[PDB]
From a paper:
One of the largest GT families in the human genome is the polypeptide N-acetylgalactosaminyl (GalNAc) transferase family (GalNAc-T1…T20, abbreviated T1…T20). Transferring GalNAc to Ser/Thr side chains, GalNAc-Ts initiate abundant O-linked glycosylation in the secretory pathway (Bennett et al., 2012, Hang and Bertozzi, 2005). All GalNAc-Ts are type II transmembrane proteins with luminal GT and lectin domains connected through a flexible linker (Bennett et al., 2012, Hang and Bertozzi, 2005, Ten Hagen et al., 2003). We made use of the fact that a double mutation (“BH,” I253A/L310A double mutant in GalNAc-T2) re-programmed GalNAc-Ts to accept alkyne-containing uridine diphosphate (UDP)-GalNAc analogs such as compounds 1–4 instead of the native substrate UDP-GalNAc (Choi et al., 2019).
As bump-and-hole engineering of a GT family in living cells has no precedent, we first set out to understand the structural implications of this approach. We crystallized the luminal part of BH-T2 in complex with the native ligands Mn2+, UDP, and the substrate peptide EA2 (PTTDSTTPAPTTK) at 1.8-Å resolution. In BH-T2, the interdomain linker adopts an extended conformation previously found in the catalytically active WT enzyme (Lira-Navarrete et al., 2014, Lira-Navarrete et al., 2015). The mutant A253 and A310 side chains in the BH enzyme are congruent with the WT side chains I253 and L310, respectively. Two glycine residues, G308 and G309, are slightly shifted by 1.2 Å and 1.7 Å (Cα distances), respectively, likely to account for the changes elsewhere in the active site. Further, we showed that BH-GalNAc-Ts emulate WT-GalNAc-Ts with regard to structure, localization, and protein substrate specificity. To corroborate our structural interpretation that GalNAc-T bump-and-hole engineering does not substantially alter substrate peptide binding, we profiled the substrate specificities of two engineered GalNAc-Ts: BH-T1 and BH-T2 (Choi et al., 2019, Gerken et al., 2006, Gerken et al., 2011, Ji et al., 2018, Revoredo et al., 2016). We note that BH-GalNAc-Ts glycosylated fewer peptides than the corresponding WT enzymes; we therefore repeated the experiment on a smaller peptide subset that allowed a more detailed view on peptide substrate fine specificities and found that glycosylation profiles by BH-GalNAc-Ts matched the corresponding WT-GalNAc-Ts' profiles. These data indicate that bump-and-hole engineering faithfully reports on GalNAc-T isoenzyme activity in vitro with simple peptide substrates containing a single acceptor Thr, a crucial prerequisite for a cellular bump-and-hole system. As GalNAc-T engineering retains both three-dimensional structure and peptide glycosylation preferences, this strategy probes glycosylation in an unbiased fashion without context dependence.
Numbering used by the authors:
A (entry chain A): 75 to 568
B (entry chain P): 5 to 13
The structure:
Amino acid sequence: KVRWPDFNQEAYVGGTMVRSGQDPYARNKFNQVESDKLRMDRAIPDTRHDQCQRKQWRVDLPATSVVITFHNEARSALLRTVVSVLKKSPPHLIKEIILVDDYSNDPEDGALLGKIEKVRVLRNDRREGLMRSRVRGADAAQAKVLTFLDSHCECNEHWLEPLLERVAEDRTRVVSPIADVINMDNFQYVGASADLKGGFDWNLVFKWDYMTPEQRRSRQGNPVAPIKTPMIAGGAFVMDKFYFEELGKYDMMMDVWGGENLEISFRVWQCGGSLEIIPCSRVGHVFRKQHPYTFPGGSGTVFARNTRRAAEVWMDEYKNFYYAAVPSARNVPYGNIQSRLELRKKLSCKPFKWYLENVYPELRVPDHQDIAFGALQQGTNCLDTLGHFADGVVGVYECHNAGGNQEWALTKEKSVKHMDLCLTVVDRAPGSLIKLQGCRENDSRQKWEQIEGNSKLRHVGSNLCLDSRTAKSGGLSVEVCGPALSQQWKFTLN
Amino acid sequence: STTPAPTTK
Ligand SMILES: O=c1ccn([C@@H]2O[C@H](COP(=O)(O)OP(=O)(O)O)[C@@H](O)[C@H]2O)c(=O)[nH]1
Ligand SMILES: [Mn+2]
């Protein structure tokens, strides 16, 4: 074993450098050339609030087992993660660093780091994904507190003590640092805004939420107080080890990446614990726009399946808004969830309604319209009743965005409806004026269909299209469908 | 597709 300053980073990183002409983003979807230029212990700016710097940390804190899983990580980024932990953490609080090599292409990426003081390397015999890889590390951990980090992170000054302090006081707090940004193109370390919380929209993709005016005002007494958060990112958090185990680890049927941070956030809040972001704790993370690795079965499929498993277990009736937002997820089998449903039951977890009202009151229920009401627009003109009733013609007029004569609905009956009147093809002879008549289910003259990417209206069972060319000489007509601006119509929602 | 970056300071 060597102390990390004696580790031969040049030999290690030199084995896998990008060659001349080669794409520096191909392997990792960040710039490996810029990662490889950095020293393993490169200095980073202290991004903490001034109030953090005047802090003495409770002394008798529990040591942690740091679990880092990785799959085909750049050697420079993985090493720099390990070193940031060893250099920026008090040694007596680092029991061990467990690297879980999740079936990387090259087993030396991990094996060579095994040389370093306090590093334990666990290589998976097959691809396991981050969830099962994290449970593997966590099951192997000897300490009383778990820390999970992604494999391209850089810990900052006194990042660890503020997290440990929270968990030492209350074992049911699951806590994360502010996620500073390591730029994926040039690897500069930049501080994140401290005014953020974790959240999601109904498509159940994690996002950062900006604090409301009132939330910020309430924090002026102490801007470094813990931020209670509806959701944590997955890349860095600290959790009491027994709490992790008792509360159900991670869902072992989740694969590769995605949705475990959603699942664990719901679980922790619904089953009586809490989530916090801790401003005095800062850890940089290389954010990316694409995953560099394979998803056995397809990245869309996998992510949807993982999310279904979380939604079906935690979200009660609210899961319906996810399927509404992501219809395609309905097509994705998700396997057996009994273990997880029973876990929820055993722990007497609270309903999702409880979470929305008490944890994430900012998330607004989606706004439902089974039917399209609005304008049928052609440039700056709108389909207009002209103020006519049954047997009158229709036309186009400057859009006034005031509904009225310019408000229509596209019915499931395949009609074009204003109140109880429908656009009626009284004569199929090309060039004929259409008329309003009372809507009847059984009037084939009143049936229209949107065609060409919802850009024209064709009369069902004909090759006739609604046409405005006759507007100045009597009103809208049916005309043979062809390339004419006068046959273009966009339904614009109210 | 991936965890998004927070807005910077
Ligand atoms: O099959 C996989 C996929 C991902 N990871 C690791 O899990 C973390 C989360 O993945 P990533 O950084 O790709 O996600 P992002 O942070 O972009 O959302 C990283 O340490 C990965 O190397 C893994 O061990 N196995
Ligand atoms: Mn990551």
